[PDB]
């Protein structure tokens, strides 16, 4: 449990300039969890460098359970939808993150199990949706935005005990003794401070 504590300290070292090759600082759990978690109860979980704005890609991988997405997928989505140059957009994501419709576009490239998205909604109506479909889903991405939010992406994953687990890639919000806390995505949304309709969810 100290190896995780030191890995979290590593993600706080912004000495070296941020780049395409160092925005991923490490892993809480490095092995694949497409379905069930490992024997230690943890799902695939990436740790981002504090100064990186790449939360969306790390949450998307926790959503999938493996290292399926990289900067190429999000840059290609931004180039296609808003006309940014592809190379520029790779550097811009490191700085400015990813809008919910870009994430939606990235996850729907993978053909197979469909992803349902609800973008630009209040937390109350998104939580009611998550409660309605709870029994039929096992993974969720929550995009936080609006007043009272810093702008962040979090992933949730359900285990065999039918308990939800919050997978947060921002290293300041990870506690080494409980890195994947037990909290449902619906209740997580009900306790957000924001009062307007700038929240988003993608579930499957």
């Amino acid at each position: 449990a100290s190896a995780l504590g030191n890995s979290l300290k590593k993600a706080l070292d912004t000495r070296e300039p941020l780049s395409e090759s160092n925005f991923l600082s490490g892993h809480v759990h490095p092995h694949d969890t497409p379905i069930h978690p490992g024997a230690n109860g943890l799902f695939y979980h990436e740790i981002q460098r504090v100064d990186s704005g790449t939360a969306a890609v790390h949450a998307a991988n926790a959503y999938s359970g493996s290292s399926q997405y990289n900067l190429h997928h999000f840059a290609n989505a931004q180039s296609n939808m808003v006309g940014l140059d592809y190379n520029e957009a790779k550097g811009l994501i490191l700085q400015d993150g990813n809008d919910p419709n870009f994430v939606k576009a990235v996850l729907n490239e993978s053909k197979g199990a469909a992803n349902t998205a609800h973008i630009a909604k209040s937390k109350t109506e998104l939580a009611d949706i998550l409660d309605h479909v709870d029994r039929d889903i096992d993974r969720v991405m929550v995009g936080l935005a609006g007043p009272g939010e810093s702008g962040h992406w979090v992933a949730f994953r359900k285990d065999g005990d039918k308990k939800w687990h919050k997978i947060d890639s921002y290293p300041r919000g990870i506690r080494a003794s409980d890195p994947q806390p037990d909290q449902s995505p619906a209740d997580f949304l009900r306790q957000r401070p924001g009062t307007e309709s700038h929240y988003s969810i993608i579930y499957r």
């Binding site: 981002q48 504090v50 990186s52 704005g53 790449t54 939360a55 969306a56 939808m81 808003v82 006309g83 940014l84 140059d85 811009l92 700085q95 400015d96 993150g97 990813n98 809008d99 919910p100 419709n101 870009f102 973008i119 630009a120 995009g143 936080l144 935005a145 609006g146 007043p147 939010e149 810093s150 702008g151 962040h152 992406w153 890639s169 921002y170 300041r172 919000g173 307007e196 700038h198």
Partner: protein, 77 residues
């Protein structure tokens, strides 16, 4: 007075009353008054280029009835 349009990827459009001398920083303040999105979460894109806060609409040759893309900035925290 000049009127520009700001269009989100969701399809929602807002009309802003602006002037050529207004800085992008001032436009983001108008978007906050109308949509409640803090300026630090706002990306504005025009003609395939992300706009910078220090410059003015005139610096980017944005003219009345021009349309700007508003994209949220979700980094981490």
């Amino acid at each position: 007075g000049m009127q520009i349009f700001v269009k989100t990827l969701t399809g929602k459009t807002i009309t802003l009353e602006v002037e050529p001398s207004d800085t992008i920083e001032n436009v983001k303040a108008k978007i906050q008054d109308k949509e409640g999105i803090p300026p630090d979460q706002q990306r504005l894109i025009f003609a395939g280029k992300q706009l910078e806060d220090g410059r003015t609409l005139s610096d980017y040759n944005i003219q009345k009835e021009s349309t700007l893309h508003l994209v949220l900035r979700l980094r981490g925290g």
